[PDB]
Design an enzyme around this catalytic site. Structure first.
Site, PDB file in Angstrom:
ATOM      1  N   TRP D  73       0.809  -1.218   0.000  1.00 54.01           N
ATOM      2  CA  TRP D  73       0.000   0.000   0.000  1.00 54.01           C
ATOM      3  C   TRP D  73       0.854   1.287   0.000  1.00 54.01           C
ATOM      4  O   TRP D  73       0.564   2.218  -0.763  1.00 54.01           O
ATOM      5  CB  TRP D  73      -0.904  -0.023   1.235  1.00 54.01           C
ATOM      6  CG  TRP D  73      -2.170   0.770   1.116  1.00 54.01           C
ATOM      7  CD1 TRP D  73      -2.305   2.066   0.709  1.00 54.01           C
ATOM      8  CD2 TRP D  73      -3.450   0.368   1.610  1.00 54.01           C
ATOM      9  NE1 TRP D  73      -3.615   2.468   0.846  1.00 54.01           N
ATOM     10  CE2 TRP D  73      -4.333   1.456   1.427  1.00 54.01           C
ATOM     11  CE3 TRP D  73      -3.926  -0.802   2.232  1.00 54.01           C
ATOM     12  CZ2 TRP D  73      -5.685   1.388   1.783  1.00 54.01           C
ATOM     13  CZ3 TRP D  73      -5.258  -0.860   2.600  1.00 54.01           C
ATOM     14  CH2 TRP D  73      -6.133   0.211   2.341  1.00 54.01           C
ATOM     15  N   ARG D 144      11.556  -5.106  18.377  1.00 56.40           N
ATOM     16  CA  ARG D 144      10.510  -5.367  17.385  1.00 56.40           C
ATOM     17  C   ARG D 144      11.013  -6.006  16.093  1.00 56.40           C
ATOM     18  O   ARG D 144      10.192  -6.403  15.278  1.00 56.40           O
ATOM     19  CB  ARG D 144       9.730  -4.076  17.048  1.00 56.40           C
ATOM     20  CG  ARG D 144      10.547  -2.895  16.493  1.00 56.40           C
ATOM     21  CD  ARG D 144      11.195  -3.081  15.117  1.00 56.40           C
ATOM     22  NE  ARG D 144      11.837  -1.830  14.714  1.00 56.40           N
ATOM     23  CZ  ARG D 144      11.217  -0.875  14.038  1.00 56.40           C
ATOM     24  NH1 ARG D 144       9.960  -1.046  13.638  1.00 56.40           N
ATOM     25  NH2 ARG D 144      11.848   0.257  13.749  1.00 56.40           N
ATOM     26  N   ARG D 171      -4.768  -2.482  -7.365  1.00 52.49           N
ATOM     27  CA  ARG D 171      -5.030  -3.311  -6.165  1.00 52.49           C
ATOM     28  C   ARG D 171      -6.384  -4.002  -6.189  1.00 52.49           C
ATOM     29  O   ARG D 171      -6.491  -5.078  -5.608  1.00 52.49           O
ATOM     30  CB  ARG D 171      -4.888  -2.469  -4.879  1.00 52.49           C
ATOM     31  CG  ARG D 171      -3.533  -1.751  -4.780  1.00 52.49           C
ATOM     32  CD  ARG D 171      -2.339  -2.714  -4.905  1.00 52.49           C
ATOM     33  NE  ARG D 171      -1.062  -2.004  -4.776  1.00 52.49           N
ATOM     34  CZ  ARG D 171       0.123  -2.600  -4.734  1.00 52.49           C
ATOM     35  NH1 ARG D 171       0.212  -3.921  -4.813  1.00 52.49           N
ATOM     36  NH2 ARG D 171       1.227  -1.883  -4.638  1.00 52.49           N
TER      37      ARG D 171
HETATM   38  C1  LIG Z   1       0.733  -6.857  -9.031  1.00 48.27           C
HETATM   39  C2  LIG Z   1       1.838  -5.916  -8.606  1.00 48.27           C
HETATM   40  C3  LIG Z   1       3.145  -6.397  -8.511  1.00 48.27           C
HETATM   41  C4  LIG Z   1       4.196  -5.572  -8.089  1.00 48.27           C
HETATM   42  N1  LIG Z   1       5.479  -6.105  -7.997  1.00 48.27           N
HETATM   43  C5  LIG Z   1       6.443  -5.314  -7.560  1.00 48.27           C
HETATM   44  C6  LIG Z   1       7.743  -5.883  -7.344  1.00 48.27           C
HETATM   45  O1  LIG Z   1       8.019  -7.072  -7.461  1.00 48.27           O
HETATM   46  N2  LIG Z   1       8.698  -4.981  -6.882  1.00 48.27           N
HETATM   47  C7  LIG Z   1       8.478  -3.623  -6.616  1.00 48.27           C
HETATM   48  O2  LIG Z   1       9.407  -2.926  -6.181  1.00 48.27           O
HETATM   49  N3  LIG Z   1       7.232  -3.111  -6.792  1.00 48.27           N
HETATM   50  C8  LIG Z   1       6.263  -3.919  -7.216  1.00 48.27           C
HETATM   51  N4  LIG Z   1       4.993  -3.426  -7.300  1.00 48.27           N
HETATM   52  C9  LIG Z   1       4.755  -2.024  -6.906  1.00 48.27           C
HETATM   53  C10 LIG Z   1       4.687  -1.081  -8.104  1.00 48.27           C
HETATM   54  O3  LIG Z   1       5.931  -1.086  -8.804  1.00 48.27           O
HETATM   55  C11 LIG Z   1       4.268   0.329  -7.678  1.00 48.27           C
HETATM   56  O4  LIG Z   1       5.236   0.833  -6.762  1.00 48.27           O
HETATM   57  C12 LIG Z   1       2.883   0.490  -7.046  1.00 48.27           C
HETATM   58  O5  LIG Z   1       1.947  -0.294  -7.790  1.00 48.27           O
HETATM   59  C13 LIG Z   1       2.414   1.927  -6.988  1.00 48.27           C
HETATM   60  O6  LIG Z   1       2.061   2.261  -8.352  1.00 48.27           O
HETATM   61  P1  LIG Z   1       2.297   3.742  -8.875  1.00 48.27           P
HETATM   62  O7  LIG Z   1       3.777   4.066  -9.029  1.00 48.27           O
HETATM   63  O8  LIG Z   1       1.565   3.887 -10.164  1.00 48.27           O
HETATM   64  O9  LIG Z   1       1.646   4.694  -7.772  1.00 48.27           O
HETATM   65  P2  LIG Z   1       2.078   6.088  -7.131  1.00 48.27           P
HETATM   66  O10 LIG Z   1       3.429   5.975  -6.526  1.00 48.27           O
HETATM   67  O11 LIG Z   1       0.964   6.575  -6.207  1.00 48.27           O
HETATM   68  O12 LIG Z   1       2.117   7.096  -8.363  1.00 48.27           O
HETATM   69  C14 LIG Z   1       0.887   7.502  -8.988  1.00 48.27           C
HETATM   70  C15 LIG Z   1       1.276   7.919 -10.382  1.00 48.27           C
HETATM   71  O13 LIG Z   1       2.154   9.066 -10.302  1.00 48.27           O
HETATM   72  C16 LIG Z   1       3.194   8.962 -11.253  1.00 48.27           C
HETATM   73  N5  LIG Z   1       4.466   8.928 -10.543  1.00 48.27           N
HETATM   74  C17 LIG Z   1       4.649   9.092  -9.193  1.00 48.27           C
HETATM   75  N6  LIG Z   1       5.903   9.254  -8.842  1.00 48.27           N
HETATM   76  C18 LIG Z   1       6.594   9.168 -10.041  1.00 48.27           C
HETATM   77  C19 LIG Z   1       7.965   9.280 -10.358  1.00 48.27           C
HETATM   78  N7  LIG Z   1       8.917   9.521  -9.455  1.00 48.27           N
HETATM   79  N8  LIG Z   1       8.325   9.133 -11.657  1.00 48.27           N
HETATM   80  C20 LIG Z   1       7.374   8.891 -12.568  1.00 48.27           C
HETATM   81  N9  LIG Z   1       6.052   8.796 -12.392  1.00 48.27           N
HETATM   82  C21 LIG Z   1       5.724   8.947 -11.095  1.00 48.27           C
HETATM   83  C22 LIG Z   1       2.882   7.745 -12.131  1.00 48.27           C
HETATM   84  O14 LIG Z   1       2.062   8.211 -13.196  1.00 48.27           O
HETATM   85  C23 LIG Z   1       2.061   6.879 -11.172  1.00 48.27           C
HETATM   86  O15 LIG Z   1       1.188   5.975 -11.842  1.00 48.27           O
HETATM   87  C24 LIG Z   1       3.921  -4.234  -7.749  1.00 48.27           C
HETATM   88  C25 LIG Z   1       2.618  -3.748  -7.854  1.00 48.27           C
HETATM   89  C26 LIG Z   1       1.573  -4.562  -8.274  1.00 48.27           C
HETATM   90  C27 LIG Z   1       0.181  -3.980  -8.341  1.00 48.27           C
HETATM   91  O1  LIG Z   2      12.366   6.770  12.411  1.00 49.92           O
HETATM   92  C1  LIG Z   2      11.326   6.480  11.828  1.00 49.92           C
HETATM   93  C2  LIG Z   2      10.129   5.982  12.565  1.00 49.92           C
HETATM   94  C3  LIG Z   2       8.846   5.744  11.789  1.00 49.92           C
HETATM   95  N1  LIG Z   2       9.034   5.837  10.339  1.00 49.92           N
HETATM   96  C4  LIG Z   2       7.868   5.334   9.487  1.00 49.92           C
HETATM   97  C5  LIG Z   2       8.140   3.995   8.801  1.00 49.92           C
HETATM   98  C6  LIG Z   2       6.810   3.252   8.911  1.00 49.92           C
HETATM   99  O2  LIG Z   2       5.953   3.648   7.838  1.00 49.92           O
HETATM  100  C7  LIG Z   2       6.235   3.790  10.220  1.00 49.92           C
HETATM  101  C8  LIG Z   2       6.586   3.014  11.481  1.00 49.92           C
HETATM  102  O3  LIG Z   2       8.014   2.769  11.498  1.00 49.92           O
HETATM  103  P1  LIG Z   2       8.750   2.166  12.780  1.00 49.92           P
HETATM  104  O4  LIG Z   2       8.739   3.242  13.794  1.00 49.92           O
HETATM  105  O5  LIG Z   2       8.021   0.932  13.233  1.00 49.92           O
HETATM  106  O6  LIG Z   2      10.177   1.842  12.256  1.00 49.92           O
HETATM  107  O7  LIG Z   2       6.718   5.150  10.315  1.00 49.92           O
HETATM  108  C9  LIG Z   2      10.133   6.292   9.687  1.00 49.92           C
HETATM  109  O8  LIG Z   2      10.157   6.454   8.478  1.00 49.92           O
HETATM  110  N2  LIG Z   2      11.227   6.604  10.464  1.00 49.92           N
HETATM  111  O1  LIG Z   3       1.840  -7.105  -5.353  1.00 49.35           O
HETATM  112  C1  LIG Z   3       2.832  -6.469  -5.012  1.00 49.35           C
HETATM  113  C2  LIG Z   3       4.183  -7.098  -4.960  1.00 49.35           C
HETATM  114  C3  LIG Z   3       5.379  -6.223  -4.631  1.00 49.35           C
HETATM  115  N1  LIG Z   3       4.995  -4.881  -4.184  1.00 49.35           N
HETATM  116  C4  LIG Z   3       6.115  -4.042  -3.567  1.00 49.35           C
HETATM  117  C5  LIG Z   3       6.005  -3.892  -2.049  1.00 49.35           C
HETATM  118  C6  LIG Z   3       7.451  -3.995  -1.568  1.00 49.35           C
HETATM  119  O2  LIG Z   3       8.078  -2.714  -1.668  1.00 49.35           O
HETATM  120  C7  LIG Z   3       8.080  -4.930  -2.599  1.00 49.35           C
HETATM  121  C8  LIG Z   3       8.040  -6.416  -2.276  1.00 49.35           C
HETATM  122  O3  LIG Z   3       6.693  -6.771  -1.873  1.00 49.35           O
HETATM  123  P1  LIG Z   3       6.248  -8.291  -1.670  1.00 49.35           P
HETATM  124  O4  LIG Z   3       6.192  -8.879  -3.025  1.00 49.35           O
HETATM  125  O5  LIG Z   3       7.240  -8.980  -0.777  1.00 49.35           O
HETATM  126  O6  LIG Z   3       4.848  -8.168  -1.004  1.00 49.35           O
HETATM  127  O7  LIG Z   3       7.375  -4.663  -3.833  1.00 49.35           O
HETATM  128  C9  LIG Z   3       3.758  -4.327  -4.238  1.00 49.35           C
HETATM  129  O8  LIG Z   3       3.552  -3.157  -3.962  1.00 49.35           O
HETATM  130  N2  LIG Z   3       2.733  -5.145  -4.661  1.00 49.35           N
END
Ligand SMILES: Cc1cc2nc3c(=O)[nH]c(=O)nc-3n(C[C@H](O)[C@H](O)[C@H](O)COP(=O)(O)OP(=O)(O)OC[C@H]3O[C@@H](n4cnc5c(N)ncnc54)[C@H](O)[C@@H]3O)c2cc1C
Ligand SMILES: O=C1CCN([C@H]2C[C@H](O)[C@@H](COP(=O)(O)O)O2)C(=O)N1
Ligand SMILES: O=C1CCN([C@H]2C[C@H](O)[C@@H](COP(=O)(O)O)O2)C(=O)N1
Ligand SMILES: Cc1cc2nc3c(=O)[nH]c(=O)nc-3n(C[C@H](O)[C@H](O)[C@H](O)COP(=O)(O)OP(=O)(O)OC[C@H]3O[C@@H](n4cnc5c(N)ncnc54)[C@H](O)[C@@H]3O)c2cc1C
Ligand SMILES: Cc1cc2nc3c(=O)[nH]c(=O)nc-3n(C[C@H](O)[C@H](O)[C@H](O)COP(=O)(O)OP(=O)(O)OC[C@H]3O[C@@H](n4cnc5c(N)ncnc54)[C@H](O)[C@@H]3O)c2cc1C
Ligand SMILES: Cc1cc2nc3c(=O)[nH]c(=O)nc-3n(C[C@H](O)[C@H](O)[C@H](O)COP(=O)(O)OP(=O)(O)OC[C@H]3O[C@@H](n4cnc5c(N)ncnc54)[C@H](O)[C@@H]3O)c2cc1C
Ligand SMILES: O=C1CCN([C@H]2C[C@H](O)[C@@H](COP(=O)(O)O)O2)C(=O)N1
Ligand SMILES: O=C1CCN([C@H]2C[C@H](O)[C@@H](COP(=O)(O)O)O2)C(=O)N1
Lengths: 213, 213, 213, 213
Positions: D73, D144, D171
């Protein structure tokens, strides 16, 4: 390529970089053409909060860190991440075990060596349960939920110098957890080497933390 | 360095780049090590919307464009900009004058050559008023408010390949104003040259516009 | 609804708001339940740079401002904008004409009343050319390029309290152009009314500018 | 307030909302004034990718979810988060234990009831180790690290309707892990109730997933 060992099994490695101190100078002046005045301009920008020119300097790192460190790190939204997946791959038996020195300054009713031992014992039992679930046909995305937060993960991190300076203000600082401080010290070392003028101006005028220099 | 002329006096120039097609492959796999399978992975990522690996490819452009084009361009928030200032510098006598061909398909009750003439006449009078105000001691930030929207400006633009693909979907398209379409065609040309596999996969599976290919 | 007149014909109006000071308290504590301690927590967050809780306070404004002001304003990427279009609508005859008092502190070789007159004359000729082009069949997106930067535009602006505080640090400050300072003073007035504790803590510990309070 | 139970002990609760379907209409038209045409405009915006007007609709949720769900998330960077801290507070004995039905369609060599049992046993031993470390004087931020990924956490999430639609595309879809799909179904239910026209237009023209409707 600059690679630094962190904790017992982690690392920070510089994969790629775009630009240098002069990129921030060329962008700020919108220069056609490709030094006391250039260094003075970096200090002026830093001193007065004109941080957008430093966004034209971009880094790509390869980081190996425990999940509890990565959770704090991944809160930095102004960057790009790609991480190993527990849904798609079998996770490695690699955990962060604190050194007995990690508890320096804390009076414990259990010896610091026995703390180390208790952490190792529970991560071994959790990893054994994880493997038993996997080997019984439980899907990986479910089996991995028993694994603890000191499990090592790896990721690629692309970040520009302005967001990197924000990361150093917050993480290269005594308020941040000691483990991520160690990663931030290595990031700072790489940043200093690739951008000496920006880094020195950052420490002098804009750095908010209390450990760098 | 790749430089392309746009409109009558504008340009798009590639200043710097970090990464290539393999950067998106190395980030997606979180590879330690530094092709049919690599090209297949790019197409898979593109086909299924896994766009984050392309954020590890970063470009820096130097653009000269009229202000009305820059206003549309600067709406792309997921990028970095540094532009010439009308507050801090005397602005140059350089305006976009449409070619008579710009009005093709439009029936006008004034000849297209006379349209060109009327645009030139008003920008000459506005620039003369601007100079008279400056030379009378009026501060630059006030004097420049009489200057029209076809005045040329210049900026540095740092953008990653994912945000660049979003820019091409919206701007390399018939719904976008013709003038910014011409800049987007040049951006696409540079993108194709530096990232051939990503660009071809983008056109085949993810590109939403109607002019590229 | 809070509405404030700015410049000769502009305005700032609050359209909608989500949350208040307690939203930053409820988010920071991740509270289930819906004051000296709550005010102390806001001051602590502000004092130590823990700004993320203030992102849960969101505002929507309706702004009428000249284009040269909107160009500076639209550089704030951590927000949402929707603006009137010169491509899709006929633009109104409404321009920012500086008061003679705008030149206070500047020795001009032309009387300040004659500066006002010269600005009015050129915007009248530019608007007349714009209308002649439109009425001759020239498309709107081309005809509007002769219009000057003091033309009024309008937009909706959705921004959270953290990005709004960044906007006030940079724009409610003597280094910012006087015209946008006047809009930032009105934004600050609305922010103070809706979030008194956050605003007072911001001025005391985090505000970087030199005009507020 | 709309509250929905998820998994065995989680929830999704709507805390606050700014705007409705008409906010996207008022922003897109930059309306002064405060329906077949308004619904037609929402469908047009949705159909043609003009998504910026939906950024003026903002939600605040309170979510209780296991850490492995929160890690996925929190990858949605275009939003705001505030989460419970394991550094600053003692963490509660609350873990996600999959139902035996979670393994439907998977042939396991261990009965699904025994899978449930093995997951419960290891989280009980890990939580006991965590408490023994805490009670021995080990700092919370270190103790933790033995806790598993199915530990429940809680956070506040502020997100606009455009980023929320991106979250639902990724999602509320069969490719996403089943556990986060269940949270996305509840987010969709709340989104549908507060913005019926936007939600219906989203499903018809822009929704990319395969479970909604
Ligand atoms: C089925 C599934 C599998 C996945 N597997 C993996 C995995 O194995 N490893 C992994 O690391 N992640 C994985 N992810 C996570 C994925 O890569 C994304 O981080 C996550 O889905 C958030 O998507 P987003 O970047 O579109 O959303 P957000 O971060 O909320 O961004 C929203 C939109 O803003 C734009 N955006 C935001 N920031 C930037 C930026 N800096 N540059 C360019 N465009 C930007 C894009 O248009 C993006 O769609 C997975 C996700 C899914 C749903
Ligand atoms: O020093 C910190 C403390 C908290 N967090 C963020 C990371 C997690 O999203 C959440 C709880 O992190 P937790 O304290 O369990 O390490 O707050 C962070 O980014 N830095
Ligand atoms: O369905 C998915 C898979 C992977 N990830 C991101 C979350 C973590 O940053 C990393 C690994 O997630 P892990 O697969 O262990 O749940 O990729 C994600 O956002 N959605
Ligand atoms: C010592 C410490 C303790 C912490 N404790 C907690 C805790 O208990 N709980 C918790 O949930 N988090 C906690 N955090 C995490 C913290 O709240 C931030 O998420 C993290 O430090 C990233 O900071 P950032 O938002 O400035 O960085 P980024 O997300 O990289 O943002 C960079 C900059 O961009 C701007 N920005 C980005 N996105 C937005 C947006 N949507 N709205 C407004 N401005 C934006 C801001 O100017 C920001 O400084 C803690 C962090 C530290 C260092
Ligand atoms: C033909 C055309 C007509 C247009 N007409 C108008 C008009 O009349 N008026 C007007 O004001 N604009 C108009 N625009 C501009 C348009 O609304 C966008 O501002 C512009 O196209 C940039 O698109 P973007 O937001 O996707 O890009 P970016 O700002 O670069 O964002 C990239 C991606 O990041 C994500 N993102 C970034 N920031 C946020 C955020 N805060 N919340 C949610 N998601 C976010 C989205 O996924 C987005 O696609 C028009 C554009 C085009 C192409
Ligand atoms: C007096 C003054 C003079 C100026 N002169 C010029 C000039 O001559 N030329 C010019 O081009 N601009 C100029 N600017 C504009 C300036 O460079 C900024 O674009 C503007 O002030 C918005 O600031 P911001 O980036 O902090 O805000 P936002 O874009 O709203 O960003 C908010 C915060 O988010 C973070 N952030 C957002 N996006 C990114 C990103 N991609 N990378 C890193 N961090 C990010 C930063 O922490 C930032 O502070 C001037 C501004 C002022 C106030
Ligand atoms: O094709 C378009 C039209 C509108 N806009 C943005 C840019 C400005 O912020 C505003 C008006 O642009 P105007 O139509 O006058 O060129 O909407 C845009 O980015 N692209
Ligand atoms: O005070 C300032 C000066 C510059 N800029 C930005 C806005 C434009 O993108 C550019 C030039 O603005 P110009 O100086 O001509 O008003 O820099 C800005 O945002 N604030």
């Amino acid at each position: 390529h600059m690679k630094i060992d962190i904790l017992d099994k982690g690392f920070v490695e510089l994969v790629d970089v775009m630009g240098n101190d002069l990129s921030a100078v060329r962008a700020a002046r919108v220069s056609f053409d490709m030094e006391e005045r250039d260094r003075h301009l970096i200090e002026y920008l830093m001193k007065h909060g004109h941080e957008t020119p430093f966004e034209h300097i971009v880094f790509t790192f390869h980081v190996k860190a425990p999940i509890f460190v990565a959770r704090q790190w991944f809160r930095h939204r102004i960057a790009s991440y790609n991480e190993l997946s527990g849904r798609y791959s079998k996770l490695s038996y690699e955990f962060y075990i604190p050194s007995p020195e990690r508890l320096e300054g804390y009076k414990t009713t259990i010896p610091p060596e026995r703390v180390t031992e208790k952490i190792s014992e529970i991560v071994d039992k959790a990893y054994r349960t994880y493997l038993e679930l996997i080997e019984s046909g439980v899907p990986r995305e479910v089996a991995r939920i028993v694994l603890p937060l000191n499990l090592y993960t790896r990721f690629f991190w692309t970040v520009n110098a302005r967001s990197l300076m924000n990361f150093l203000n917050l993480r290269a600082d005594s308020h941040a957890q000691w483990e991520i401080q160690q990663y931030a010290l290595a990031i700072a070392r790489i940043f200093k080497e690739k951008c000496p003028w920006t880094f020195e101006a950052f420490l002098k005028y804009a750095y908010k933390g209390d450990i760098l220099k």
